[PDB]
Amino acid sequence: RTKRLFRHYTVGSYDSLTSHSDYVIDDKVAILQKRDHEGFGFVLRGAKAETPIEEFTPTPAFPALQYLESVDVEGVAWRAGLRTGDFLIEVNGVNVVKVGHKQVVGLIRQGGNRLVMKVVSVTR
Amino acid sequence: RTKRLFRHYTVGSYDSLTSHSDYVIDDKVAILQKRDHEGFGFVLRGAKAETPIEEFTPTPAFPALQYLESVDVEGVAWRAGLRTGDFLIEVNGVNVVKVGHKQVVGLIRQGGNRLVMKVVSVTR
């Protein structure tokens, strides 16, 4: 049950034993309601781009362009289940995987006190 | 000056832009002082071994056998700067990179209300 996969490589009487653990992709939905003065409690970080970057290709390690660079502990987002490193997938019914920072920020701001997001967590 | 490395890969006129970040290996010393009844506030996880596994080979991905599965927020370890996924290098000055789980836990309990841990945070 509780066990990790290790690779045992051996050549010419030398051994190495290394761990090669796959990325877990864990999707969640967050609903955030704030007060007029308070923040949602997160710092968003991602690529600057005027238009979506079509050729952008999600990988297990990097699903999307905009991610949470930090989350205020016991702030609105934290309470809603958001954690540092979550990748933004959808923001108020808009797909944002490939979307530049300014536009995502603009969507979040159009929402006012309410923000509803699909995000993804990744761990190894 | 804030930026991220991507790889632009093209062949046969098909294009793919993927994140291509260098591993950031951050070593830190955490010093934990708990009260008699509180815990250090973390769950340690890693390979069982009655003796050190000498043939273990550290990689950027997976530097050591024991790591932080979870850290309770607002707890002692959290406040000391420890986070989920850190790899234990030293415990109370003793190298634990290749040390079995039972023995590392032992070293920790031996310290009483004090715990000094050298850890590394791997991010990409």
Binding site: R45 | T2, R4, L5, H8
Partner: peptide, 15 residues
Amino acid sequence: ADSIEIYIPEAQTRL
């Protein structure tokens, strides 16, 4: 065919 590394700039925004 080619493979090229590029730094794309990123922004931070507290919300």
